[PDB]
Design a protein around this ligand. Structure first.
Ligand SMILES: *[C@@H]1O[C@H](CO)[C@@H](O[C@@H]2O[C@H](CO)[C@@H](O)[C@H](O)[C@H]2NC(C)=O)[C@H](O)[C@H]1NC(C)=O
Ligand SMILES: *[C@@H]1O[C@H](CO)[C@@H](O[C@@H]2O[C@H](CO)[C@@H](O)[C@H](O)[C@H]2NC(C)=O)[C@H](O)[C@H]1NC(C)=O
Ligand SMILES: CC(=O)N[C@@H]1[C@@H](O)[C@H](O)[C@@H](CO)O[C@@H]1O
Ligand SMILES: CC(=O)N[C@@H]1[C@@H](O)[C@H](O)[C@@H](CO)O[C@@H]1O
Ligand SMILES: CC(=O)N[C@@H]1[C@@H](O)[C@H](O)[C@@H](CO)O[C@@H]1O
Ligand SMILES: [Ca+2]
Ligand SMILES: [Ca+2]
Ligand SMILES: [Mg+2]
Ligand SMILES: [Mg+2]
Lengths: 235, 237
């Protein structure tokens, strides 16, 4: 990895649809604008961007979607949310229960309901890509949901355990899968394709000299939050 | 129809995926950030946003996509580009030739061999939504491409003419279709469904009392640029 340092400090970063967003330890919300992390209105502990929009959650687990000029609350509660899927939203709540919203509901406004679908299982972190979603549970075990589509956000309905341990995991729009483990090591899943969505093995890489805290990938660029909150941008 | 005036001045506006973007007469590029049209770096004569990203074109007809902190030049030439399709790119070039880029290609970077698909026909303006794309030709005749999908961006391959005249047309993520004609009137297509993607008729509406220039719709909100460059934000009954 050839990386550069990007100025700023974050605890979480997400990249998708050409955007790069994140939050810092004070839960200030940032968008990468002309190569500068730029604060926007809001208080969020997790901020995601991708083909499903700009989605975040606050400390109280309220869910927000950026629309028509600002964050608007969506009905429900989640501790983490991802917008990487194919116009679907996915996330987990404080009890590690797993939810997704289908494209037809995501794109309906006004709405007198947000018809979340519960997935069978437990995860502390859940991220979606073009044809699958990956997550980890409270014991850092790794899972894939295959056959996810825009109006079948719940997929095949049966999670598959993928050997290994990760503390968080992100799925990119080109299908790439990266994660960080409890030791702050960084990994990519090799051999991931639409035909083989589970891929083949894990390979380690190093962007942060001091340990990695958070990772996301989009459009040939790997984004890292290091242990100290500093940011790396990698090809 | 209820409308308010929103501060700013543009020649073109697009809304999609909860974002609203546009360009002004100077080709300065704007994003609606915390309810204020905020200038970001870049020179573009058309700026689009939707599930396929933030896409634009400049005076030279070079194509740009916002990626990884700024605008990145793509391979190809377009005079107008739209990002409202299902992770596909669509547009027209200086000869009114029509192009789309499939989802898997749109998401691949670097892209040294970009597999643009040329569609059969001529349009001066082309916009995509969840299951179809709509466009108009240089004589303001209106066309739909049916059966468009993420990795068959060319759809059925055969454009169907829809009666009426429009100068531009935009398709929303919920399938709504709006357009503005050369006289500055504003229309919505009625009867549009997945089963009946071409819909059934046009209905006129008035947001700009002195004439409409450009329209886009996203998530229950209709956005107008009026003839004078002023902006309206409207909510339908
Ligand atoms: C920013 O958000 C984080 C996460 O919600 C806050 O840290 C949590 O604070 C709550 C009490 O509100 C505790 O129950 C949790 O143990 C904390 N979580 C973690 C991971 O530390 C943090 O306080 C917020 N920061 C500010 C400045 O408000
Ligand atoms: C902004 O962009 C527009 C569109 O490219 C420019 O207007 C065109 O100028 C070209 C010269 O390159 C003429 O050939 C066209 O007739 C013009 N088109 C239109 C619609 O006016 C305009 O000059 C640019 N403005 C600035 C300040 O850069
Ligand atoms: C994401 C979210 O808030 N999901 C909720 C779930 O918590 C709740 O139990 C249920 C009640 O019917 O509605 C939704 O599915
Ligand atoms: C993500 C993950 O669990 N990666 C593992 C790593 O922990 C382990 O140390 C290594 C050695 O066998 O194999 C894999 O790369
Ligand atoms: C989009 C479009 O072409 N609308 C036409 C309008 O031009 C015409 O004046 C009206 C009355 O015949 O019929 C349609 O509404
Ligand atoms: Ca993501
Ligand atoms: Ca559009
Ligand atoms: Mg003003
Ligand atoms: Mg799709």
């Amino acid at each position: 990895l050839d990386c550069t340092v990007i100025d700023g400090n974050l605890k979480q970063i997400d990249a998708g649809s050409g955007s790069v967003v994140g939050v810092n330890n004070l839960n200030e919300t940032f968008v990468l604008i002309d190569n500068v992390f730029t604060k926007i209105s809001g208080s969020l502990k997790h901020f995601s961007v991708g083909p499903a929009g700009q989605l975040g959650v606050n400390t109280a687990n309220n869910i927000f979607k950026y629309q028509s000029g600002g964050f608007v609350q969506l009905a429900g509660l989640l501790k983490q949310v991802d917008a990487g899927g194919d116009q679907i939203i996915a996330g987990v709540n404080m009890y590690d229960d797993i939810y997704c919203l289908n494209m037809d509901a995501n794109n309906k406004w006004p709405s007198s309901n947000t018809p979340w679908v519960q997935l069978n299982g437990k995860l502390k972190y859940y991220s979606c890509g073009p044809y699958s979603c990956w997550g980890v549970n409270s014991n850092d075990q790794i899972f894939i949901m295959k056959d996810v589509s825009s109006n079948v956000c719940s997929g095949s309905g049966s999670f598959i355990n993928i050997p290994g341990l990760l503390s968080m995991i992100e799925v990119a729009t080109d299908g790439s899968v990266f994660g960080v483990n409890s030791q702050g090591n960084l990994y990519q899943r090799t051999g991931v394709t639409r035909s083989k969505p589970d891929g083949t093995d894990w390979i380690s890489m190093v962007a942060c000299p001091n340990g990695h805290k958070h990772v996301s990938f989009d459009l040939g660029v790997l984004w890292l939050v290091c242990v100290d909150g500093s940011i790396r941008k990698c090809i």
